[PDB]
Design a binder for this molecule. Sequence first.
Ligand SMILES: Nc1ncnc2c1ncn2[C@@H]1O[C@H](COP(=O)(O)OP(=O)(O)OP(O)(O)=S)[C@@H](O)[C@H]1O
Ligand SMILES: *CC(=O)Nc1nn(Cc2ccc(F)cc2)c2ccccc12
Ligand SMILES: [Zn+2]
Length: 406
Amino acid sequence: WPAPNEEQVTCLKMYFGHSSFKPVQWKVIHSVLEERRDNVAVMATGYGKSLCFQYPPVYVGKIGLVISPLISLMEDQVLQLKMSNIPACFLGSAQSENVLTDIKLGKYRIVYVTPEYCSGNMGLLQQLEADIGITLIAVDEAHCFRDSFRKLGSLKTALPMVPIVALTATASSSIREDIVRCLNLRNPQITCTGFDRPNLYLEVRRKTGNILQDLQPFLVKTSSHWEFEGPTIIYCPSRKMTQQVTGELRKLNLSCGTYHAGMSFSTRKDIHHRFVRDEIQCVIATIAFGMGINKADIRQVIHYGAPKDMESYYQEIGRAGRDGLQSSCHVLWAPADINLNRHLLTEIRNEKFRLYKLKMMAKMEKYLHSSRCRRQIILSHFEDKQVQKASLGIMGTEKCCDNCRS
Ligand SMILES: Nc1ncnc2c1ncn2[C@@H]1O[C@H](COP(=O)(O)OP(=O)(O)OP(O)(O)=S)[C@@H](O)[C@H]1O
Ligand SMILES: *CC(=O)Nc1nn(Cc2ccc(F)cc2)c2ccccc12
Ligand SMILES: [Zn+2]
């Protein structure tokens, strides 16, 4: 494996602020830049998946195409890029003609587009590659599904020289093969970023049948006022449970924001941004709240109800402690929550992924009932080459998990 040169490291520091590339980030970046190779990267939350597709077009001064149906989330990525002096935009049906002319003139490094727009404008994409050059096409599977990827199968046929970086939130081997055939990838480099988040203390406790009684141990009294220790996310299995929990917390005059897909994108965006600006201390959310939170100091994550499955749990708690400081992740559960989760696993159309999720769910109930190290149970899914000294140094201590405490 080759090392990045001074031009490469200086570009990383100037436009991204990082002094070094993480091992898997450099494997993906180098393979796209030098070998023009398709990549499939199994991405664990918190690693740094964005640099894999944002950095290459910035370094070569060309276009990087980012595909996702989530337009609602593209503004924050575009706005963040423009703040780091990286020209970026959203390209769509409702975009002005002057933005499209500026894309054709090579004024934008990162162009965010939907799968739907791609399908209807393949000729524009071919013109863009011939005249300007497309460094890469990035596709996040977590942002979508096979029906949305069916429109993207013509990408490798129309742009054979443009490498595709497909990012996925699951280690499922059948999903990996589905994304390879859906996008017609050619000899893709397969990488994975599974890692321990050692600054996350883990704890599981049983629900008492009373919301305030369950959440009271997490609250501190600052002079006379009840509040959380720091920025907190409470995950609920339903929109109705987010409303119940919020209503109870507001009886204590706690600074809250509810977040779920029943609220408009405008109301949701408002809650998210109030959390980032620290105007609200707690966000009570369904799993709809998670992607691109852009909050480094989440101190506490509470799953108010058993998590759907072990893999989902691993990904959701990864939104805590992005600053590297001490954070806590608590699960509050009852055996009746498990009965409910089981029924929702039959509503998976891929029987190969449904069985994968069923093994992940069986691991979840074992994890919840266990007397063993929580971190050891989660890390038992990774190869030893990914478990480092920092993780071993934390396991067996008070800062690891409830079962490692005395
Ligand atoms: N080379 C790097 N050096 C240091 N930190 C990095 C590096 N690459 C990424 N990170 C950090 O890794 C964290 C996660 O970044 P990403 O995974 O790209 O975030 P994201 O794409 O917004 O994903 P979500 O939606 O928040 S999971 C951030 O704190 C990054 O700044
Ligand atoms: C190589 C690699 O990172 N593998 C990987 N395996 N999983 C599955 C998993 C399930 C539950 C859990 F607690 C941890 C891991 C994942 C998930 C996410 C990213 C990578 C991987
Ligand atoms: Zn432990």
